[PDB]
Design a binder for this molecule. Structure first.
Ligand SMILES: CC(C)c1cnn2c(NCc3ccccc3)cc(NC[C@@H]3CCNC[C@H]3O)nc12
Lengths: 279, 286, 65
């Protein structure tokens, strides 16, 4: 369960500043290691973040058309794996294209989605020899990824809390006559929430509740009494204020998110390929 | 890494175990799925009656898992004729097993491999559930499991009838079998095949009916059986008091839903009655 | 030295989850898929799925890193 999970204990961070510090530390550590080992070829932390967002989108696309049909829990686990890995690692050291496939592979294993390695690499849009090489790279990086996750493999996603909240709304909140009308829109917000760092900063229950209440807000429906009455937050005013602040910060995170730009990602991909070819 | 190998503990088909410094280290598909299962489940669980995963590492596709070192297991206790199993000792073992199982089920995980050799004991007499290589989360509707889990002697009748969807009963039934093995010092239902296992279960406990198990014939591998009267529980366990017999009956109910859960078993009069469970430091050691 | 049961006291940092046996009475089970007779025979009930979903929904809702 989340309330005593490794995700809550170790992989939920206090602020975006802490995440930026971790990523800058990873970038500077790679720079120091390369200087001791081996220039403007180096990537900046914001460039690394842009490439990480692009390859998270690529991982989403790969998991979307994966045959057999990938459970959404597996996709969430793989995306969280990617985020956690590149919290403490530089894309110039470990290429995101292989790391994301390793994340998908490990997530398939962890979430008990039985898919054989040949049919895992058959989903790749590459030649059979390319698929074999990619399989070899994934097998090389599997233990590396597991080590960099600190052997914390169970990932608590917001989908089951979303289902539980929908059940609770259907049962105890008749004011919202049909909570199902909130699903689609809320799901959309969930996806957008996944694009930010919210998964490293907020609980899955908070993320699901924020998605549902934002869907209600775009629907023109106020369910403040659901927090107040149903969740008994009228008793704890500070708890209600903290929850509302968490949701507002989450919405601000979504509104401040910027998609990677195609020219920027092309230039940064050239720089990343130069980094991997060199050193 | 930081572990000096001390002794060779045992070797199985699946892994090899070493006593190292005191801990126990267990060694194109990539990293093996059972080791990943153990890692992913034991990292999210923390209870005195569940084996603790202290560390893990490896190289390439091989991996080693570090656990607390255990002195013995319940199988060695049962098979040791010199050891005398008092009702206090049996209650202590059952209490520790059920507390671990209650913690496990509360976090929505089925062990699915409960047996005396998977119930490990340390030098302080603290029993812990081990060998989570078959453990799996439960409570998900779409998640369908295989019915070939649990060792056949401890397999529940619903599993032997091919149940894909199941709950804590598949552990509780095993618990009951373990309890029976604690009372008789021999395997309760030592079948040599699934059909033989079902036949032994029905010849000992009686052939279940619709009243005892409303949806019995709906299981895809259900087999019709000759109506057996079954041996009365007090005849099988002549030394078992009424409270222990009630516990056994609750653990061996054919209906998995009606079968008592770990919490309900812990609430039974047997555990709160005299004599109290033997303290862990006073439990017998082989 | 007599044993006495006490339920596990693990903080969930969220709203209280209704008891498993009272899910049907409170009306929760009307909003989850009913278990098939085979699932019921195996010991799986819709109450399990509903309870797990509610527990996941309420877990750590009030927690701050
Ligand atoms: C948690 C695991 C990795 C562990 C911890 N201590 N320990 C010991 N200790 C020695 C021993 C000797 C006799 C009976 C029990 C334990 C032996 C051992 N043997 C490997 C098998 C693992 C599954 N259960 C049966 C066991 O033989 N596995 C383990």
């Amino acid at each position: 369960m989340y309330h005593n999970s490794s995700q809550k204990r170790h992989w939920t961070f206090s602020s975006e500043e802490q995440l930026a510090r971790l990523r800058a530390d990873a970038n500077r550590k790679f720079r120091c290691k390369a200087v001791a080992n081996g220039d403007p070829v180096f990537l900046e932390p914001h460039e690394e973040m842009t490439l990480c967002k692009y390859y998270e989108k690529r991982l989403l696309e790969f998991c979307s058309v994966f045959k057999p049909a990938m459970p959404r829990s597996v996709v969430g686990t793989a995306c969280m794996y990617f985020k956690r890995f590149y919290l403490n690692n530089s894309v110039m050291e470990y290429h995101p294209r292989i790391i994301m496939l390793t994340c998908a592979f490990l997530a398939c294993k962890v979430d008990e989605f039985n898919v054989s390695s040949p049919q895992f690499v058959g989903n790749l849009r590459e030649s059979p020899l390319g698929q074999e090489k990619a399989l070899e790279q994934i097998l090389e990086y599997e233990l590396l990824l597991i080590q960099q996750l600190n052997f914390h493999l169970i990932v608590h996603n917001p989908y089951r809390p979303f289902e539980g909240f929908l059940i609770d709304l259907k049962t105890r909140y008749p004011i919202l006559e049909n909570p199902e009308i909130l699903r689609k829109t809320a799901d959309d917000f969930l996806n957008r929430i996944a694009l930010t760092d919210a998964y490293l900063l907020y609980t899955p229950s908070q993320i699901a509740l924020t998605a549902i209440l934002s869907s209600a807000s775009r629907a023109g429906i106020t369910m403040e009494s659901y927090l107040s009455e149903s969740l008994m937050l009228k008793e704890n005013r500070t708890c209600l204020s903290q929850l509302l602040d968490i949701m507002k910060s989450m919405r601000n995170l979504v509104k401040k998110y910027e998609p990677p730009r195609s020219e920027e990602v092309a230039v940064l991909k050239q720089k990343l390929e130069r980094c991997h070819s060199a050193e | 890494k930081r572990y000096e190998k001390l002794d060779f503990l045992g070797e199985g088909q699946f892994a090899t175990v070493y006593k190292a410094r005191i801990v126990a280290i267990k060694k194109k598909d990539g990293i093996n799925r059972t080791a990943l299962r153990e890692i992913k489940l034991l990292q999210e669980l923390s209870h005195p009656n569940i084996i603790g995963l202290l560390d893990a590492f490896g190289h390439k596709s091989n991996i080693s898992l570090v656990f607390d070192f255990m002195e013995t297991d319940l199988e060695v206790i049962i098979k040791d004729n010199s050891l005398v199993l008092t009702p206090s000792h049996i209650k202590a073992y059952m209490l520790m097993t059920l507390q671990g199982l209650e913690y496990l089920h509360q976090h929505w995980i089925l062990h699915r491999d409960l047996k005396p050799n998977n119930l490990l004991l340390d030098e302080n007499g603290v029993l812990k559930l081990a060998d989570f290589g078959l453990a799996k989360s439960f409570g998900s509707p779409n998640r369908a499991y295989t019915h070939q889990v649990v060792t056949r002697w401890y397999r529940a009748p619903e599993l032997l009838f091919g149940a894909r969807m199941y709950g804590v009963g598949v552990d509780m039934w095993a618990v009951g079998c373990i309890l029976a093995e604690l009372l008789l010092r021999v395997p309760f239902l030592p079948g040599d095949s699934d059909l033989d296992q079902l036949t032994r279960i029905f010849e000992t406990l009686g052939t279940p009916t619709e009243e005892q198990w409303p949806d019995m014939c709906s299981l895809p591998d259900y087999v019709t059986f000759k109506s057996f009267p079954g041996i009365p529980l007090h005849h099988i366990f002549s030394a078992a008091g009424d409270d222990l017999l009630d516990l056994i009956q609750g653990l061996f109910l054919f209906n998995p839903c009606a079968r008592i859960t770990a919490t309900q078993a812990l609430k039974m009069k047997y555990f709160s009655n005299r004599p109290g469970p033997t303290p862990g430091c006073q439990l017998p050691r082989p | 030295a007599l044993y006495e049961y006490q339920p596990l006291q693990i903080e969930t940092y969220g709203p209280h989850v209704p008891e498993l046996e009272m899910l049907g009475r409170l009306g929760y089970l009307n909003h989850v898929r009913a278990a098939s007779p085979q699932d019921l025979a195996g010991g799986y009930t819709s109450s399990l799925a509903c309870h797990r979903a509610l527990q996941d929904a309420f877990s750590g809702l009030f927690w701050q890193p």
